[model samples]
Target chain A: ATKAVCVLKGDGPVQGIINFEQKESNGPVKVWGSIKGLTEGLHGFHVHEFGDNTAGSTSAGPHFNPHVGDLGNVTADKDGVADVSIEDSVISLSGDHCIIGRTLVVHEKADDGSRLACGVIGIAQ
Target chain B: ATKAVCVLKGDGPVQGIINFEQKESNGPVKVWGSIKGLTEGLHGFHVHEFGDNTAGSTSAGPHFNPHVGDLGNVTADKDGVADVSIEDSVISLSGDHCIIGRTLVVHEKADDLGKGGNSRLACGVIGIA
Candidate 1:
């Protein structure tokens, strides 16, 4: 039972849900989720190092570099729908680099690292 | 704004939003919010010291006792809804006893003096709102 979930929300109508599941102890984590209330383009999607969502997303810290939380940008279609399904290594639900108590942030622009909306990763069952 | 917000979610269909507001510099924090998807009884509601929700609430740490977050309980009616709007004189949104970076947790039973605790249903970190 290796799984995690997060709900992202911003000043605007931006809202998102991110789910992570590891098939095995040392296997890749299958990440799936969706984000709405975005512009038509790509946005910076990352798992930050902290769960502190105070003062917008500043306290959430930067990208969890060298880890699976830095899964790069995700695309939002014309209808402002961004869906992601990625299989990532280095992101574990347990063991090294466990992603609990972190955060999932959807930035306003592409890779500018601007904080938009964020949600903390929690135990999903 | 002198307010904070937290969204709670758990393994079941439980989810909620708790908001806190302080009127004066040293005034009581006005706490208000609603919770649903619960049984018909009182649930343990408290703010824990850590924002970590790892391992299904185990990592969220224990209640914030001897602090403002040790709120006793939240009552859910027959419809499984709990509306809380109470003034906590000991709580502060800022200053020396800030509750930031902590967590608001809803347990399966009523909360007491941080003993014989209940299981965590869902929790969210407190942030500026």
Candidate 2:
């Protein structure tokens, strides 16, 4: 089994860690992460197209949906913290659709395209 | 129309150009690439997941098949050159499955799960044009 990690960095105290685990080459990839410092509501969480965060959140480009649908959303608690967990088959850790070098962005509102915090997906060492 | 271009680089005299053309937001993307200096056979071509070709051919990562199938192959002529043209709906220049910042890799041999002798020959990073 192989795993990857992303440490989200953005403005303000909002930050988090996203973990991706793949048990096999042809198996489903499990995505789980926790974030903090949100607005205590539903937030859009997605994998963006680019990993070059040089210009900050806006530089990450658009949402990453290698497949035809969205990756879903993340809900925050009253204290602005969110724990996210989901399983996806479209993304992989070793194949053509691998998610490494991409950006995971957390939006300010649910289904809204406003990015707040983001992190680059990298191999876990 | 929006376009994207890739300038390929590799080991030997093998290099090429890949062009992508999209006429509308929700339209099929036209892919056309020309390569040189191969072994004159069928080559496995694909859009890899990463655009960082820093470590050479291997750094581009695996193929980029956003959908459930492979992106197909490229045939090189006897002169070790190839001219490729194809259309795909799975990859895009914008929206959820954008191909910008990805890598286009040309393999040495045909697809056999990238086994022995099926290594990457050349690569190019996809960028806006």
Candidate 3:
């Protein structure tokens, strides 16, 4: 098993942060974390691909779908629902694999069900 | 009284990123951030008014709502919910101020939300779905 950790920083006008962790097992990855001193409200979280960790959070790519798996990818042998095996799972805070290579983002506004902010979890060395 | 920071940049395969902050007294103005190496999920974030940290994070805008305040803008008076006193607030990881400037996203196969990636928050900023 391996583990990784990342810390969120709070700056001017707005301020708050979260501690994240992840553990990789044979079957699936395990994740968990906590937030503190935030503006107090609902935020977003998930697992993204890329290890850039640059200036802003944009260094990481789109949700890590290397296989073009959303809706436009085609199948080589079949069609119905297109069983193109791409590895990407939406981890919800309400689930067990919550923090594993997942991303977490706090919005300055309501999602209205819109997707935003981000985080990820994985075995780091 | 406070400081600022930023992080975001990815080469290929649509990676991920996030980490932000804020601290100011007097009345209100607070923000924060976080994210990890991902491959399976939803992603989006804000407070993006501007700090320079560049790449895919798209320069963080819109949702911060500079002051135009929703709707189509109007007179100095006479309107119900159109007070137009922009300080910017939409944080709802679920509420209590929720997430302060409010922003979050994830849609590989879902999110009939129709907001799309090329849209904007605070009502101005081009995103891409």
Candidate 4:
């Protein structure tokens, strides 16, 4: 099995954690975590490809697409917490579409598009 | 004159401000700013094209080519602060490869511009200064 984690961070004190795990090659990745510092409504969340500190410019992030529902508007409680969990079938841990060393970003608004927090996906033991 | 700014922020209370300004259409852009909360060493920095909330995927950042030194390594002092200033001739604020609405990222490692194991420590979208 392979595991990866991303610690969401941003300009504000906003913070959270999202984890991914795959039991086999070409298997669906289980994404689960809780993100804080969001509005009481729904905020769009997605895992973008590429992982460069130059804001991912070198390895800049991207829209992990197709089954986009795997990453859609994630709702937050009034306290600004998002507990996310999903079985993503499109993304992978290895091969042609590997998302390892990429990025996971949270949006300020739901799909309207301004980014809020960000974290680079990294390997975990 | 063209002006731009990026308010760098990361996971661990990391924060800094990098600014850019160009006096002429084709002249070099002056970049200057101080960033705090970094390890003592040189951290790579660069301007990446495209700005998408979904982390630039709609605009997904890229390896803008050629004179890449305009976007190069920035060193942080023993206090974990980086005061950076450079007149970059390669990057543009106007025209075809304009970087406005794009992203400026800080790297976890030194970058020679080859897609390194550089993990993004922080990022900010370039906007009007």
The lDDT of each candidate is 0.74, 0.72, 0.29, 0.67
lDDT of 3: 0.29
By lDDT, the better pick of 1 and 3 is: 1
Is 2 or 4 the stronger prediction by lDDT? 2
Best by lDDT: 1
TM-score, candidate number 2: 0.48
lDDT of 2 by residue, B8-123 (tens): 76877788877788999779999887889888888887887666554666876766655312466788898888898989887887666777657778887786544567478887
User: Residue A53's C-alpha lDDT in candidate 3?
Assistant: 36
Kindly indicate the candidate among 1 and 2 with the higher lDDT. 1
Query: Compared with the true structure, what per-residue lDDT tens digits does model 3 show for residues A1-125?
Result: 14333333323222222232223333332333443433344333434443223423455455434322121222212211112122224332223433323333433333222322333322122
Query: What docking grade does candidate 2 earn?
Result: incorrect
Model 2 spans with C-alpha error above 4 angstroms: A1-125, B65-69, B112-118
Order of candidate numbers by lDDT, starting with the best: 1, 2, 4, 3
Candidate 1 docking band: incorrect
Give the range of the ten consecutive residues with the poorest summed lDDT in model 1 chain B.
B49-58
Model 4, A1-125: lDDT tens digits are: 27666667777756787787898889888889899988888887776644443542223445655234236777889898989988877787666566654567888778656667866565432
Task: Identify the candidate with maximal DockQ.
Answer: 1
TM-score for all predictions? 0.56, 0.48, 0.28, 0.49
The TM-score leader among the candidates is 1
lDDT for position B55 in model 2: 63
Writing each residue's lDDT as its tens digit, candidate 4 over B1-129 gives 977666666666567877788989788888999888888898888765433323422233564442342388889899999999988877876665455545677777876656565676776555543
Docking category for candidate 4? incorrect
Task: Name the lDDT value of residue A60 in candidate 1.
Answer: 74
